[PDB]
Design a protein around this ligand. Structure first.
Ligand code: PLG
Ligand code: PLG
Lengths: 410, 410
């Protein structure tokens, strides 16, 4: 009945479902969640106000909510090996804000990865509250290797004297050495915060090393590789920091939490505890590597750092099309959606960029394997090399429908 | 059948659905959303990253999200009579942070309603980002009348000279005069921001005059009287302000918006544009006045300000029990949920308080009318008077059950 009351809206919703089905989604930060995760978010837990924490709420009627939120906290702790977790943050951005509010004061100096080399807005962009409220100094990757250089970062930290060093990225493909990051922090008396949003699913699956034992605080989105609902999570092993973080999230930054989304976080966390989640990780890794190999081997394309050891990579497209916006547009013409992306030391406009970013998680969740991944990468190459040949694009689009038909979304 | 995979979680959701069904929910900030609102939040829109705004997004394949977000925006504009809307804020709290970021600077001075008299945490509590970043100086209500004194407030503003005045409350039962707050702001060169979270539904129905033509910026939750999903929303008629508001929400404070929630916002807003929504407004007013009438007349209970012209009211219970907190524990024992609440010039610990806050929107959304409202108040009065007599509560509990069964939740 309700779809009949509001056809403009439900038309659009059904349209997005079909668009997800008919597109090869390579946006590295997307995934395809389980029906269970969506169903948890679609429940009447949305009607409950629950300011406060389990056992100390500011409203009655919260005993069941407590069981739910407590499930979520305990499942995170268990899955990531942390002594404390906070599952209330609305987003990754909010989780990160809460941590800054807990460990440093406005105007304090913070080191963060450079936007262009893979850092997130909340790691010090001047347009973000992060850059506005704190004095962020950025570190980069090496210009020749495109890898983190832990000695250079140490040398810079010794000069800069930060209160906090932030590690983690949106577009770095290689394994990060968290033990080195903590060594660096320790050497200049800084806190270390790790934002593992992109890699949390791989930390869970055993395919990326955990920052949890080395960071004072670890943040993540519950979406992305962890294949959860859209939201945030915070972890730590320090009881005192945990009190500060809890106060920072509420009443410091947020009001009432989204308990329906929290339910959905509990769902996702239990899915990631299942042994099958190790299989998903292994496949995420293989699928991304297979796609990258195609570009490595092709002479007109270069993969940043020469490859990947996680779920994503970047490709410099500028020998074949003008810039990354162009490549993003062309691939979209063949129902392959990704995002243009700055590469390290990017020479072009931020609105244009020299690169594209590709990820495996969504296709891996639809059940695709190495060969499909390889084929996709061939079609991307082919579409960019023939971007001005409508007839080729038309043909690729049809080949892609065969593949999407063959691995249905749900 | 995924519920079989996680029975702890899903049993808990069932428990909460039965708690909500067998409970008279009088927490004034709660409501009961339509199946359609829940369904929209349970969609696969949760899979989609949409940093940016309609037409100017960071990622590809966002043409359908844009239709959905544009519906929410267009509906908020039609419904509230505003020229601009931003529907991305994750919460009421995030919405208010964004306005401050847009209109004033850290350290600037702001007047907002005092917490004891029903201002919100984000209107200046020293444990909120609001009081930590900006110099909040509170106005109160008259000590006698327990009403807002616009003369007193004008004079205080003339001493204080705030950059911004914030009006709106979580616990004031009377009409707020937004024309007066704007003439007050105007007299000192201040912006006026109204946070209408509690009354947005009544504004929507015509039962409370609107702040929108008087406030430079209006904020609200989408949950509460507007009967929508948990979320925030921001309105203005000034274009230059709108641009800032948008930059503040993203990349200023947030990252990716919750487009499934935004779909749900769109749903709720079309519901509120339906002429049936005015009938709901009407009953919300009446049901609250009826529950309030019972306490006025009872000699052991005073109702703050003497009564109400909106969806809520406060009651001093200290005659009959020690404090608000105790009231709340007792009433919960008969399946009546509300919250303890400071009364103006609260004497007692804020962990205790002298009052209860009562609201009609949830019970009105279940179909109850004046007789049931009145009866519910009788039951409350009765349970507080008989608070250590378990055989009585047991009886009230049973009579409550008849009424909850009679007005089933969905
Ligand atoms: C590392 C990192 N941290 C925080 C966030 C922010 O999360 P919210 O959008 O939930 O605020 C992101 C999003 N990154 C977007 C991307 O790479 O596509 C991120 O990659
Ligand atoms: C006036 C007002 N403004 C903002 C908020 C905060 O919204 P979020 O909780 O979505 O951040 C509230 C919550 N008020 C809680 C209550 O009345 O019980 C509020 O009452």
């Amino acid at each position: 009945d309700y779809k009949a009351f509001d056809p403009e809206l439900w038309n659009a919703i059904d349209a997005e479902a079909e668009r997800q089905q008919n597109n090869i989604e390579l946006i590295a930060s997307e995934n395809v969640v389980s029906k269970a995760v969506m169903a948890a978010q679609g429940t009447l837990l949305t009607n409950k106000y629950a300011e406060g924490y389990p056992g100390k709420r500011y409203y009655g009627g919260t005993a069941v909510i407590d069981v739910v939120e407590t499930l979520a906290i305990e499942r995170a702790k268990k899955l990531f090996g942390a002594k404390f977790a906070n599952v209330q943050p609305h987003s990754g951005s909010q989780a990160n804000a809460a941590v800054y509010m807990s460990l440093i004061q406005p105007g304090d100096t913070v080191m963060g990865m450079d936007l262009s080399a893979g850092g997130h807005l909340t790691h010090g962009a001047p347009v973000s509250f992060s850059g506005k409220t704190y004095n962020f100094v950025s570190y980069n990757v090496d210009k020749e290797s495109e890898l983190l250089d832990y000695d250079a970062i140490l040398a810079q930290a010794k000069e800069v004297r930060p209160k906090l060093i932030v590690a983690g990225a949106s577009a770095y493909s290689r394994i990060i050495d968290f033990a080195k990051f903590r060594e660096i922090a320790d050497a200049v008396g800084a806190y270390l915060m790790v934002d593992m949003a992109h890699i949390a699913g791989l930390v869970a699956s055993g395919h990326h090393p955990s920052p949890v034992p080395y960071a004072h605080v670890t943040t993540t989105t519950t979406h992305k590789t962890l294949r959860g609902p859209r939201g945030g999570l915070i972890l730590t092993d320090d009881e005192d920091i945990a009190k500060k973080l809890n106060s920072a999230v509420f009443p410091g930054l947020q009001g009432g939490p989204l308990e329906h989304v929290i339910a959905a976080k509990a769902v996702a966390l239990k899915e990631a505890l299942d042994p099958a989640f190790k299989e998903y990780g292994e496949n995420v890794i293989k699928n991304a590597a297979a796609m990258a190999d195609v570009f490595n081997q092709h002479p007109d394309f270069r993969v940043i750092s020469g490859g990947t050891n996680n779920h994503l990579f970047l490709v410099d497209v500028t020998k074949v099309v003008e810039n990354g916006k162009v490549a993003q547009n062309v691939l979209e013409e063949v129902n392959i959606t990704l995002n243009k992306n700055s590469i390290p030391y990017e020479q072009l406009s931020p609105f244009k960029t020299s690169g594209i970013r590709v990820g495996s998680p969504a296709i891996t969740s639809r059940g695709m394997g190495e060969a499909e991944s390889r084929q996709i990468a061939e079609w991307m190459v082919e579409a960019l090399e023939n971007h001005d040949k409508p007839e080729v694009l038309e043909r690729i689009r049809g080949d892609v429908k065969v593949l999407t038909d063959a691995f249905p979304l749900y």
